Amino acid sequence: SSMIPLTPLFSRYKDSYLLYSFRLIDLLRASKSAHLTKLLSSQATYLYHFACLMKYKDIQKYEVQQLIEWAINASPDMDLQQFRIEFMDKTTELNLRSCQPKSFTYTFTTIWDTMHFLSLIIDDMVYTRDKSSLDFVMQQLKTMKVLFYNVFFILQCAMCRDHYMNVKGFLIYHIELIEIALDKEKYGTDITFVDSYNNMLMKNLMAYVIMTFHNHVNDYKWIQRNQKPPAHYERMTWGEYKKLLNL
Amino acid sequence: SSMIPLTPLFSRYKDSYLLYSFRLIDLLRASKSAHLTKLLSSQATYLYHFACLMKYKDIQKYEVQQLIEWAINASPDMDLQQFRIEFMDKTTELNLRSCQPKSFTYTFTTIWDTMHFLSLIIDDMVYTRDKSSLDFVMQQLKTMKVLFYNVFFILQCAMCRDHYMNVKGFLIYHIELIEIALDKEKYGTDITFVDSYNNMLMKNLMAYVIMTFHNHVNDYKWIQRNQKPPAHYERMTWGEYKKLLNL
Numbered sequence: 001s002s003m004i005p006l007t008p009l010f011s012r013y014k015d016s017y018l019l020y021s022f023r024l025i026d027l028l029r030a031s032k033s034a035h036l037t038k039l040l041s042s043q044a045t046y047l048y049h050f051a052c053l054m055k056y057k058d059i060q061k062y063e064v065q066q067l068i069e070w071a072i073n074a075s076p077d078m079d080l081q082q083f084r085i086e087f088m089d090k091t092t093e094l095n096l097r098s099c100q101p102k103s104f105t106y107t108f109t110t111i112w113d114t115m116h117f118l119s120l121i122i123d124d125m126v127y128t129r130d131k132s133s134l135d136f137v138m139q140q141l142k143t144m145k146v147l148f149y150n151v152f153f154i155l156q157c158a159m160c161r162d163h164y165m166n167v168k169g170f171l172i173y174h175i176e177l178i179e180i181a182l183d184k185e186k187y188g189t190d191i192t193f194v195d196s197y198n199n200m201l202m203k204n205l206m207a208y209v210i211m212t213f214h215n216h217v218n219d220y221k222w223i224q225r226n227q228k229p230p231a232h233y234e235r236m237t238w239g240e241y242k243k244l245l246n247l
Numbered sequence: 248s249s250m251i252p253l254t255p256l257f258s259r260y261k262d263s264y265l266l267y268s269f270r271l272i273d274l275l276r277a278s279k280s281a282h283l284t285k286l287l288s289s290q291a292t293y294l295y296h297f298a299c300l301m302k303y304k305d306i307q308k309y310e311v312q313q314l315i316e317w318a319i320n321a322s323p324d325m326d327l328q329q330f331r332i333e334f335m336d337k338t339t340e341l342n343l344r345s346c347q348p349k350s351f352t353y354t355f356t357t358i359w360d361t362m363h364f365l366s367l368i369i370d371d372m373v374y375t376r377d378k379s380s381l382d383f384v385m386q387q388l389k390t391m392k393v394l395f396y397n398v399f400f401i402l403q404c405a406m407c408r409d410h411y412m413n414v415k416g417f418l419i420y421h422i423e424l425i426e427i428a429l430d431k432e433k434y435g436t437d438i439t440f441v442d443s444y445n446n447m448l449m450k451n452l453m454a455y456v457i458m459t460f461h462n463h464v465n466d467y468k469w470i471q472r473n474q475k476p477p478a479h480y481e482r483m484t485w486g487e488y489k490k491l492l493n494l
């Protein structure tokens with residue numbers, strides 16, 4: 001059903017994304033408030049939706065609700081390593097092996113990979129909209145905006161949080177931009193897909209967008225630090241990026 | 248000192264911007280809190296800075312501090328029309344006729360014109376940086392980001408506020424992008440100015456950016472309303488926009 005090519009990089013993205021979703025539900029047992037439990041639970045709901053449930057039209061939505069319910073009720077005092085044990089036990093129990101990470105080392109790269117994963121899901125949903133509907137895609141895009149608006153870092157970086165709070169709109173803007181092309185199709189002018197950035201839409205737009213945003217954040221971090229970029233620092237190019245993902 | 252061409256449209260922008268700054272200080276007498284008075288006072292400080300003070304290197308900064316102080320102390324019960332009288336009296340008193348609006352009819356267009364004004368100031372500061380310094384421009388850009396982060400609508404539109412909260416980062420992103428080109432110049436690679444959107448920067452980038460953002464918000468409003476765009480609705484094109492402003 002999904003047309004995303006299988007590549008070593010997409011495999012890494014998917015695994016990082018599952019790790020991210022795991023570190024997120026891990027936060028549930030330690031939630032300081034009902035309001036945060038509600039926010040965390042809806043984020044994990046959407047995350048698992050996009051990675052392991054949507055393939056089967058969310059038929060397993062209740063099993064995820066149960067995984068979330070279990071996570072909220074787990075002990076706040078147990079170690080991340082104990083939670084890992086029980087999490088793996090519970091996901092197997094619930095027939096959600098597909099939602100389990102294989103690698104558990106969490107870095108900034110995990111969070112970036114997670115964002116790049118979503119960008120690919122977004123482009124793929126748009127590409128294959130004729131197999132779902134315009135309405136279904138519009139509804140998934142609303143959820144995507146909520147997801148990007150509410151990114152939890154998990155690791156500690158107050159500078160990262162403030163900065164993302166300031167520029168996350170660049171990402172949401174491009175989701176609205178897709179919604180505009182879909183609505184123009186709804187009203188009678190099919191999307192024409194183009195190579196470059198009355199109804200035109202760049203092919204693989206969202207993959208390009210987040211690649212671009214990822215370079216921008218890394219260029220900006222040298223200004224934050226008030227330093228010349230390291231001698232070996234280099235941006236990802238769109239030519240290489242498309243080849244790595246076979247776009 | 249400023250290289251922005253004089254055109255009827257730029258005149259309208261400047262007047263709208265002064266009206267906006269006036270409607271902002273009008274809010275001071277009615278402020279519900281110290282925290283809001285502080286936020287409102289810093290916004291008006293920056294606004295007048297960019298429109299009527301920076302030409303003379305903020306030599307009149309204290310007169311504006313006095314205008315703000317007066318506005319905070321004015322009666323909360325007097326009518327906008329009374330405040331207009333006294334405001335005009337006080338600005339004349341303080342030799343700030345240059346900061347007075349001529350037209351007082353406040354619309355969404357006033358707010359857009361205000362944003363377009365700032366975009367032109369941003370491009371102009373970058374263009375003429377050799378006459379100030381890289382540091383001075385970097386410092387003005389920080390202030391620009393604060394200004395755009397904290398836009399008050401003044402008129403009532405809860406939909407507008409939520410939406411701008413979600414996508415304002417598109418604008419701030421482009422301010423950081425300018426900061427990246429300036430820092431790359433600092434470290435030894437002059438900016439090359441280009442026509443289209445190792446150190447390249449689009450000429451009139453920020454004018455293009457906010458023009459683009461203004462079209463996006465107007466396209467998006469039909470999706471919010473769940474309607475086909477009106478038969479006579481049309482986007483501004485960059486070709487016409489540059490001619491209107493003689494860019």
Ligand SMILES: Cc1cc2nc3c(=O)[nH]c(=O)nc-3n(C[C@H](O)[C@H](O)[C@H](O)COP(=O)(O)OP(=O)(O)OC[C@H]3O[C@@H](n4cnc5c(N)ncnc54)[C@H](O)[C@@H]3O)c2cc1C
Pocket residue numbers: 108109111112116159160161163164210211212213214215217218221224235236
């Ligand atoms: C949302 C977010 C906001 C952040 N904000 C800040 C901040 O304000 N200040 C700060 O100092 N740090 C911030 N960070 C972290 C920063 O972006 C780096 O990830 C971190 O400094 C580690 O750098 P790294 O050298 O390990 O490179 P990373 O960028 O983390 O590299 C990880 C992997 O990504 C690949 N890669 C590099 N560029 C791209 C690209 N453009 N597209 C796709 N893949 C790419 C690399 O090949 C490598 O495989 C933020 C991170 C995120 C996720």
Ligand SMILES: Cc1cc2nc3c(=O)[nH]c(=O)nc-3n(C[C@H](O)[C@H](O)[C@H](O)COP(=O)(O)OP(=O)(O)OC[C@H]3O[C@@H](n4cnc5c(N)ncnc54)[C@H](O)[C@@H]3O)c2cc1C
Pocket residue numbers: 355356358359363406407408410411457458459460461462464465468471482483
């Ligand atoms: C920051 C902000 C956020 C907003 N968010 C929303 C929202 O979420 N939902 C909503 O319904 N409304 C929103 N609005 C208002 C909306 O953008 C319109 O301004 C409003 O609906 C009135 O439309 P209008 O027909 O009078 O056109 P306006 O766009 O307000 O037109 C005013 C003038 O701008 C010119 N113009 C048109 N397009 C451009 C362009 N791209 N660049 C430069 N000039 C242009 C026109 O020629 C005209 O002279 C927002 C406004 C602002 C300032």
